[PDB]
Amino acid sequence: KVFGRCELAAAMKRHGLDNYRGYSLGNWVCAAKFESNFNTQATNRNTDGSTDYGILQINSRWWCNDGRTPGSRNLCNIPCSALLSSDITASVNCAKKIVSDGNGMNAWVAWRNRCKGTDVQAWIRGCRL
Ligand SMILES: [Cl-]
Ligand code: NA
């Protein structure tokens, strides 16, 4: 599913991401925009052989099992394919573990390079939340 901006904002809000660990909703919408263009089916392969899955491009080296990343952990305890669903629940739940891990949202390179320090509230402007 390709979400609309306000549609995703409302779904993330319902799943408890607004101000989760201090990060306002606009941060999470901005990250999803630049990681996946709001497309739950997005995948991208990395040079190390791991793959990034779903709306928040969660990586198979640490967070999910895709059966082809030797020596990876599966800290969210899920198949990576479950992250590609039009229901964002599994993605959100796994993102909550990632962002509690110590370096916060810097774990998402696109957030660090394109969202951090910007006016992120613009990503939820206009939405009925
Ligand atoms: Cl933090
Ligand atoms: Na893994």
UniProtKB/Swiss-Prot annotation:
Biological process (GO), any one: defense response to Gram-positive bacterium
GO cellular component: cytoplasm; endoplasmic reticulum; extracellular space
Domain C-type lysozyme per the UniProt entry, residue ranges: 1-129
CDD domains membership: LYZ_C
Source organism (scientific name): Gallus gallus (Chicken)
Summary of the tissues where the protein is detected: In the egg white and polymorphonuclear leukocytes.
UniProt subcellular location: Secreted
UniProt binding sites for substrate: D101
Alphabetical keyword list: Allergen, Antimicrobial, Bacteriolytic enzyme, Disulfide bond, Glycosidase, Hydrolase, Secreted, Signal
Taxonomic path: Eukaryota, Metazoa, Chordata, Craniata, Vertebrata
Catalysed reactions listed for this entry: Hydrolysis of (1->4)-beta-linkages between N-acetylmuramic acid and N-acetyl-D-glucosamine residues in a peptidoglycan and between N-acetyl-D-glucosamine residues in chitodextrins
Enzyme Commission identifier(s): 3.2.1.17
Top-level lineage group: Eukaryota
Keyword Signal on entry: yes
Oligomeric form and interacting partners: Monomer.
Role description: Lysozymes have primarily a bacteriolytic function; those in tissues and body fluids are associated with the monocyte-macrophage system and enhance the activity of immunoagents. Has bacteriolytic activity against M.luteus.
Key word Endoplasmic reticulum present: no
Pfam family for this entry, one: Lys
Protein name (Swiss-Prot/TrEMBL): Lysozyme C
Record-annotated active site: E35, D52
Disulfide bond residue pairs: C6-C127, C30-C115, C64-C80, C76-C94
Family statement drawn from the similarity comment of this UniProt entry: Belongs to the glycosyl hydrolase 22 family.
